[PDB]
Design a protein around this ligand. Structure first.
Ligand code: HEM
Length: 123
């Protein structure tokens, strides 16, 4: 019984990636930063990544290799502003998930830390 299975498995992340990406999609600043006309495959990459990370299927890494996230975000201008907006849509996406307090909190803390860590603009 992993964290993965406990929070609701695959359909929880689908829900989370989906709700996060609607928030991202409708963001004046974040949206033009996702350089795809179609945001479907980006959603998908997130969904899979989160699954894998929390102890679900290793699909992400069998499709793309290692996550090396800080490396993969290297092309992008991720400063305090971009991070804070990313967070706003994650919070909203986590909230809608309506997970039990402790499971919510662990997932949130991770997401917070990871974004804080993703900031890569010497500033
Ligand atoms: C901190 C603010 C962040 C910004 C502005 C940001 C921005 C982006 C952008 C523009 C892309 C490419 C999307 C595309 O393909 O069109 C991307 C990819 C991705 N992001 Fe972030 N990101 C942030 C933080 C995070 C965090 C905290 C996580 C994970 C917990 C994450 C997970 C991913 C993953 C898994 C990909 C695709 C990885 C792959 O290429 O296989 N990002 N991000």
């Amino acid at each position: 019984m992993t964290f993965y299975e406990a929070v609701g498995g695959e359909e929880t992340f689908t829900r989370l990636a989906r709700r996060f990406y609607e928030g991202v999609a409708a963001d004046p600043v974040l949206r033009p930063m996702y350089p795809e006309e179609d945001l479907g495959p980006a959603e998908e990459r997130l969904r899979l990544f989160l699954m894998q990370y929390w102890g679900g299927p290793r699909t992400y890494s069998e499709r793309r290799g290692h996550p090396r996230l800080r490396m993969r975000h290297f092309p992008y201008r991720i400063g305090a502003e971009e991070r804070d907006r990313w967070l706003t849509h994650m919070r909203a996406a986590v909230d809608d998930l309506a997970l039990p307090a402790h499971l919510e909190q662990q997932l949130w803390e991770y997401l917070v830390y990871a974004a804080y860590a993703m900031v890569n603009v010497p500033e």
